[PDB]
């Protein structure tokens with residue numbers, strides 16, 4: 001909407017207070033005009049019609065329980081935008097400052113979140129499996145990264161290309177979490193998963209097997225569930241990424257870590273320059289090797305570590 005840029009304050013899902021960029025015109029809207037062509041957050045009102053109504057608030061204070069998922073979807077979308085701009089010189093998900101739109105309070109007891117081709121969408125969870133999913137910065141960045149992939153490699157969402165699509169979202173979701181530097185880890189969804197169980201998460205990148213996911217290509221899922229295992233076989237790529245960054249010895253293959261920033265540079269270049277809609281794991285390895293060569297040289301340690309990481313997870 002047309003109005004003047006303002007700054008509100010509220011409380012997120014985890015009870016933390018944060019300032020949020022809003023817009024004033026009679027009401028205060030969750031519309032952040034300081035980033036690109038705007039970040040817009042909507043109320044889906046427990047229904048499934050999208051996007052719902054642009055979030056309006058009478059006093060620019062967002063401390064009601066009902067407000068909390070909106071606060072975090074809006075704030076964490078901004079942080080993710082900042083990451084892509086400041087770290088990779090990418091302006092929003094299309095590279096052209098496209099408006100970023102999110103809906104919260106999607107459906108009733110909905111234990112998921114997703115990118116629907118046009119916007120991000122967050123359930124509130126059922127209170128036992130999940131609390132409102134926009135409470136996880138890695139969740140928000142995972143979803144916005146799906147948009148980035150849609151506009152770049154376009155990885156089809158099934159089988160190996162879909163597991164790469166998923167792993168890209170977990171990788172950059174995690175790198176955004178580290179960027180924001182609030183309780184960062186290599187786990188996915190720990191801030192919103194199972195409020196009655198401490199220490200768990202939905203997925204682990206450092207040890208995918210902790211939650212049953214494969215950490216070696218020989219252990220890949222080959223059936224048809226989950227679009228052919230896109231959230232399962234992502235563990236193979238997530239482990240490789242973790243090893244590129246942090247190092248380790250895995251199935252007897254030793255990897256010298258090169259750190260998160262170089263991981264991000266290599267996989268961002270692969271995503272935006274070399275991957276295609278039908279890329280499989282072996283092609284992802286080639287894309288990462290070429291990206292690391294581009295950035296650091298064919299004889300670099302970075303190239304050597306990419307190769308060792310993919311060797312360690314059985315991807316030639």
Ligand SMILES: COC(=O)[C@@H](N)Cc1ccccc1
Nearest residue numbers: 001024025026027028029056
């Ligand atoms: C111009 O009047 C309108 O658009 C009316 N819907 C009143 C309204 C104004 C601004 C914000 C919300 C409601």
Ligand SMILES: [Ca+2]
Nearest residue numbers: 057059061062
């Ligand atoms: Ca208010």
Ligand SMILES: [Ca+2]
Nearest residue numbers: 183184185190
């Ligand atoms: Ca964390």
Ligand SMILES: [Ca+2]
Nearest residue numbers: 138187188189
């Ligand atoms: Ca995490």
Ligand SMILES: [Ca+2]
Nearest residue numbers: 193194195197
């Ligand atoms: Ca938990």
Ligand SMILES: [Zn+2]
Nearest residue numbers: 142146166169
């Ligand atoms: Zn995903």
